[PDB]
């Protein structure tokens, strides 16, 4: 009730033993009462890493998007070494989501070790279990066993209906995914431990399908974009292997379904000046010229009968002299023209009435004109060319043309292709006009050049007119056991990308969320644009160009700070080489580096002065010892993990408190939340996301099952909980409920909608589902059910809810109104209370413990000692936790070495990887979340309670007691031992 | 959006008189020029005579026989008469309407590709 505390642990270790005389009651009645729960207390173990590798190939329908929806590939395996290093081999296939589906070494959900089908953004399918969400649940085929060798895959995937089937060996599996998020773009992935060796296949020239596909399915490798090229790639990543060494990456960036859509501007619609009579007829007369060149180029003659064999013009005359259905045509071509440039929020019109004189035309000799005689002399346009904006005009224009195309296209059924196929209406310059190559994007321009060239040379009048911040901004530093607080330093950093990297000296004290150089803990430079940033850019030297190297050098003895470029300083405005002056120690510095989106940089130590490159010309003779010389193993470092994770509320928060009154009469204990500063300068107001720091589990099984009578209050199940919402507060856009301890939605605009939930329907031997079992992620009213239920009323909105263990229907309600907000989970599931509000008042919402008629309080399900006490209670360890953005996670010494390459046309693509890697997870029982024991090194209070806990099994076993040394056996493990003492950091 | 269809062109022995009429029910606007096409069984889709707006008639290769062509503007129809059969003659007929007229779009692809097809009948010879 009271939280972790070492102090109650020294307490029971002084229990145990005393006066060096054991009490073997004792020790076996606190073993008796701890041991066996295996919770509320720190739990390791060993475990495999898992890399997941993906083809490069998106794929996701939207309304007008180019894709066709319908996709299909295979995979071979062919070498699987099970139970590899005393623990089985991990290998699955599937499905992922573009957005939500970032995979990174241990951390898993649950216990480490994730993979695909283990978030609800991706599906894989094992041997005979399908995963999602992290859930396993064996699949029914006709042969039931795991990946081996020599097996075949095939994963099939419909975006019309929600559809994901696979097949094993021929054989089809009897469980698909349905009703799932279309949101984003979907990939084939696959993930693998070490010992593995896969196969893709994709169809066409790449690989083959052993198998024929579905009907009405095409095979992956028509999706790859005109501009892309096939080559496997991991899923995400911080850190490359390069030439210098460790090269650290930034966020990536990736494409949106809304991106394959094509999106113009409606042009004719528009009115057009007078214009369009006068000098637009003189643009066609120069089309009608140039385009008679051109077939007196190719050799086109002038025969009246239209002939494209024969080569012959219809109209057979110099002037077009074109009817009504041709001539008409090209000048509403040219009309469409001035139509699409006048949208560009460009100009139509004349303003010379002169230049058109000025133009002579180009004379050329007999030869163009044959047959009848055609021979359009091609009207100079030399007196004004084309400036940069022009070009940009013809961009423009090409762009609107290839979009109205594109939506006529998608308007009639054409979906995109690799290949082109006009039988089934497959093209492949669907794609938008920033998709195209650069080929069709000269054939779209082309034309459209020569048509502003006309508008030149007569002179027209033409003129020309917060989670994504964390996703796109990614901070490197160090273990920060290394802090400096005297002497001279210096580190290099390769910008291999001209583009915007912040490196330089940081506090212990830097909050990811906060930019390099923002705040005053953190004195960086930015030479993107080549200014030192502290409390702002202030001009400092040069910007580098791709491939220069920084000397960041700082002395604690003078406290300053210097940066170099390629071996020269770099030089202030006022002429200072130092970027700061009297930079005071406080508790030292750190080096730190930021990259940006879609970058790339070394970042070296001075562990290495061999490679340590330009030391000798500015860092050495001057006193600058280069940073962790010595150091024999790698320095750690920790990077700035972008991931919603719950934490604890701060109690120095500026614009949010938490009250937290309790014990009142005919009101049950409840927690407040007040906005400190909502109404005055600076009230910033945002989506928060809240819940409760303990969650309640579920019965294992799921066996059915005035004044409060109290044989009900014995033998009832239900658990009960209340919401108090303020006047003020908005009563849409919010949410009661229970969340998952994995569920993480740092969403800006958050519905209900946006919450993450499949059905997995398991067909039977005859193809009827059975077992269709939604996993979701969350479970909670809608803001629109709130206000419905219900100016704000004055009265404050009371959000009743009823949880049932015994059976698992889910129960809510609103100022007394059971809301028809209902759900249904499954058995040995546990879940937080969660409150989601959009801040508009000064008081917003109040968490409140309270039982009702023949209801038990929440805290007996939430603490096992008052199980039975009606007494409604608030412990000090019931907090509330808000969902905190950026997290800062600790980067793995050593990777797995996966090696990836195309064997040929027949086997495609071939991943191999053989290195075992094993590490240490701690798990954190009520957060069902596991963490590095690495990673404890900047955690304290974790390690003084998990040393605390260790003291106390020692206290436990001591004097020789076997047998609960036999029963701590199954705690602490042998190899977990021998790894403990092989462990260097 | 222009939803079009050929009408006509059963099964008859040699020398049957068959005739298609192709209808496209759409926008008004770009509506200048139009053809047929021919697809042999297992085959390439070849160019049947086509015809554009002011009744101007274009042939090719594949137009040995009786490929009568007639286009009404005001109603917005085009018949096709198949009197000449012959063996190799047995294909489906498809019909497309598309903007460039005569052949020919001083624009390039955008234009070229601005085009309809049709549903299409098929065509046997006995």
């Known amino acids: 009730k009271h939280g972790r505390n070492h102090k109650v642990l020294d307490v029971l270790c002084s229990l145990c033993v005393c006066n060096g005389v054991a009490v073997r009651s004792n020790q076996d009645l606190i073993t008796e009462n701890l041991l066996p729960g295996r919770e509320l207390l720190l739990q390791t173990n060993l475990i495999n890493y898992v890399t997941s590798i993906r083809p490069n190939i998106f794929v996701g329908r939207a309304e007008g998007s180019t894709q066709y929806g319908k996709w299909y590939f295979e995979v071979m395996v062919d070498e699987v070494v099970p139970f590899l290093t005393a623990q089985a081999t991990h290998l699955r296939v599937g499905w992922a989501l573009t957005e939500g589906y970032s995979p990174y070494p241990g951390g898993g959900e649950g216990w480490g070790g994730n993979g695909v089908g283990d978030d609800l953004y991706s599906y894989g399918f094992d041997g005979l279990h399908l995963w999602t969400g992290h859930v396993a649940r064996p699949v029914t085929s006709p042969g039931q066993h795991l990946l081996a060798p020599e097996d075949v895959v095939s994963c099939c995937l419909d975006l019309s209906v929600p559809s994901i089937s696979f097949r094993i060996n021929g054989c089809p599996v009897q469980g698909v995914f349905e009703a799932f998020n279309l949101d984003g773009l979907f990939f084939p992935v696959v993930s693998f431990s070490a010992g593995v060796k896969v196969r893709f296949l994709l169809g066409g020239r790449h690989g083959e399908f052993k198998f024929l596909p579905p009907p009405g399915y095409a095979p992956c490798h028509e999706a790859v974009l005109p501009r892309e090229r096939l080559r496997l790639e991991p899923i995400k990543e911080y850190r490359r292997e390069g030439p210098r060494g460790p090269h650290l990456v930034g966020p990536s960036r990736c494409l949106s379904h809304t991106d394959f859509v094509p999106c113009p501007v409606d042009t004719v619609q528009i009115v057009l000046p007078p214009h369009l009579e006068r000098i637009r007829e003189k643009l066609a007369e120069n089309i009608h010229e140039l385009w008679a060149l051109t077939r007196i180029e190719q050799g086109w003659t002038y025969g009246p009968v239209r002939d494209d064999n024969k080569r012959l013009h219809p109209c057979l005359v110099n002037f077009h002299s074109l009817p009504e259905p041709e001539r008409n045509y090209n000048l509403q071509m040219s009309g469409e023209t001035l139509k699409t440039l006048l949208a560009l929020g460009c100009h139509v019109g004349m303003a010379d009435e002169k230049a058109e004189d000025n133009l002579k035309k180009t004379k050329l000799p007999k030869t163009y004109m044959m047959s009848n005689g055609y021979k359009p002399a091609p009207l100079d346009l030399s007196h004004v060319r084309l400036t940069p904006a022009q070009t940009t005009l013809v961009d423009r224009l090409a762009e609107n043309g290839h979009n109205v195309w594109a939506r006529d296209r998608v308007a009639q059924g054409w979906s995109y292709s690799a290949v082109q196929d006009i039988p089934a209406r497959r093209n492949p310059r669907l794609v938008p006009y920033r998709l195209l190559d650069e080929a069709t994007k000269r054939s779209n321009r082309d034309s459209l050049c020569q048509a502003v060239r006309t508008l030149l040379g007569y002179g027209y009048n033409i003129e020309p007119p917060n989670q994504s911040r964390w996703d796109r901004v990614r901070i490197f530093r160090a273990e920060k056991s290394y802090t400096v607080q005297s002497g001279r330093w210096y580190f290099e950093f390769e910008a291999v990308t001209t583009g915007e990297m912040r490196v330089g000296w940081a506090r212990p004290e830097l909050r990811p969320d906060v930019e390099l150089g923002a705040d005053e803990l953190a004195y960086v430079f930015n030479g993107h644009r080549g200014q030192r940033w502290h409390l702002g850019s202030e001009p400092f030297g040069r910007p580098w160009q791709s491939g220069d190297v920084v000397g960041c050098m700082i002395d604690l003895t003078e406290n300053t700070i210097i940066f170099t470029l390629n071996g020269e300083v770099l030089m202030s405005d006022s002429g200072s080489e130092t970027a700061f002056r009297e930079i005071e120690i406080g508790d030292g510095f750190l080096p730190v580096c930021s990259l940006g989106p879609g970058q790339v940089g070394h970042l070296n130590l001075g562990q290495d002065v061999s490679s340590l490159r330009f030391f000798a010309i500015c860092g050495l003779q001057e006193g600058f010892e280069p940073f962790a010389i010595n150091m024999q193993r790698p320095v750690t470092t920790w990077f700035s993990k972008s991931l919603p994770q719950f934490e604890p509320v701060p109690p120095e928060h500026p614009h949010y408190e938490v009250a937290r009154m309790d014990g009142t009469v005919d009101t049950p204990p409840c927690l407040r939340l007040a906005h400190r500063t909502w109404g005055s300068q600076n009230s910033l107001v945002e989506m928060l996301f809240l819940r409760l720091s303990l969650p309640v589990q579920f019965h294992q099984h799921f066996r059915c099952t005035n004044r409060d009578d109290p044989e009900i209050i014995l033998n009832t199940t239900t658990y009960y909980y209340s919401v108090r919402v303020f006047a003020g507060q908005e009563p849409s856009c919010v949410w009661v409920g229970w969340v998952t301890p994995d569920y993480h939605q740092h969403d800006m605009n958050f519905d209900l909608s946006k919450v993450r939930a499949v059905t997995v329907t398991m067909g039977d031997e005859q193809g009827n589902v059975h077992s269709s079992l939604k996993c979701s992620n969350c479970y909670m009213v809608w803001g629109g059910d709130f206000v419905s239920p219900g100016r704000i009323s004055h009265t404050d909105l009371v959000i009743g809810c009823l949880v049932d263990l015994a059976t698992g229907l889910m129960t809510f309600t609103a100022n007394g109104k059971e809301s028809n907000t209902f759900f249904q989970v499954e058995p040995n599931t546990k879940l937080f209370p969660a409150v989601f509000v959009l801040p508009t008042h000064q008081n917003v919402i109040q968490f409140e413990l309270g039982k009702q008629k023949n209801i038990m309080p929440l805290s007996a399900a939430m603490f096992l000692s008052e199980r039975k006490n009606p007494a409604p209670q608030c412990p000090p360890r019931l907090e509330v936790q808000m969902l905190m953005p950026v997290s800062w996670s600790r980067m793995p010494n050593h990777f797995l070495q996966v090696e990836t390459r195309r064997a040929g046309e027949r086997l495609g693509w071939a991943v191999q990887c053989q290195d075992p890697l094993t590490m240490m997870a701690l798990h954190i029982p009520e957060e069902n979340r596991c963490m590095d024991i690495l990673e404890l090194s900047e955690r304290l209070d974790l390690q003084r309670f998990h040393s605390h806990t260790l003291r106390l099994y020692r206290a436990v076993c001591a004097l020789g007691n076997n047998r609960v040394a036999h029963a701590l056996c199954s705690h602490v493990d042998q190899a977990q031992l021998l790894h403990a003492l092989e462990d260097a950091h | 959006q222009v939803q079009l269809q050929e009408s006509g062109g059963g099964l008859m022995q040699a020398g049957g008189s068959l005739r298609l009429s192709c209808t496209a029910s759409?926008?008004?606007?770009?509506?200048?020029?139009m053809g047929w096409y021919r697809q042999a069984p297992g085959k390439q889709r070849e160019l049947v005579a086509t015809?554009?707006?002011?009744?101007?008639?274009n042939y090719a290769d594949s137009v040995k026989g009786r490929f009568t062509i007639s286009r009404d503007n005001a109603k917005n129809t085009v018949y096709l008469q198949m009197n000449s059969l012959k063996p190799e003659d047995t294909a489906v007929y498809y019909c497309?309407?598309?903007?460039?007229?005569?052949?020919?779009?001083?624009?390039?692809?955008?234009?070229?590709?601005?085009?309809?097809w049709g549903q299409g009948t098929q065509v046997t010879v006995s």
């Open positions: 497309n309407a598309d903007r460039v007229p005569n052949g020919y779009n001083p624009w390039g692809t955008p234009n070229d590709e601005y085009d309809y």
């Open positions: 759409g926008s008004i606007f770009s509506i200048n020029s």
């Open positions: 015809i554009t707006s002011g009744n101007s008639i």
